[PDB]
Amino acid sequence: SITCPPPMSVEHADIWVKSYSLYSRERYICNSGFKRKAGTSSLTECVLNKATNVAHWTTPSLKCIRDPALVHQR
């Protein structure tokens, strides 16, 4: 019956969590004007600290970068 807390913030991204349930998989999405850096992942998962019975969201490797499409028109 374990569930995760609200997820932590990722810079320039937002998240809407469909399920707070253990092992739930969710994704951060870069804000308008930003794009996920190639080779970084937006996935986060609700996981268990085994010898604590407390669950947390994994930190994604996601990095949100200014959209290169725009970086050229200012």
Partner: protein
């Protein structure tokens, strides 16, 4: 001994990855250059390689990581032995994994001789 191009082994690692992920549920969308211009092919290859790492990370799987690691080792090798005004990786269309890997095979055929 016969010299076999690294890209051949890259192609068969891609096939191996395709088979291994069938059982799993990787649902990432990935930057995918579906029609690589010869003039930008190394830029494009580098994007494919970066985005393969996302499939690997998100998999949480030993065999997938080991296959991905072997693939990119093989690719970097070949790429050792200047393109200007090519799109950044993040300018590319994002596609599902299946289309991603199909287009990855396609670029690899460009590097074979």
């Amino acid at each position: 001994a016969m010299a076999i191009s690294n890209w051949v082994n890259v192609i068969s690692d891609l096939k191996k990855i395709e088979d291994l992920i069938q059982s799993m549920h990787i649902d990432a969308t990935l930057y995918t250059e579906s029609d690589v211009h010869p003039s930008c092919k190394v830029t494009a290859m580098k994007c494919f390689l970066l985005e393969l790492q996302v499939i690997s990370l998100e998999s949480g799987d030993a065999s997938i990581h080991d296959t991905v690691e072997n693939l990119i080792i093989l690719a970097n090798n070949s790429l050792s032995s200047t393109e200007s005004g090519c799109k950044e990786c993040e300018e590319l269309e994002e596609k599902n994994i299946k289309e991603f890997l199909q287009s990855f095979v396609h670029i690899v055929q460009m590097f074979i001789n």
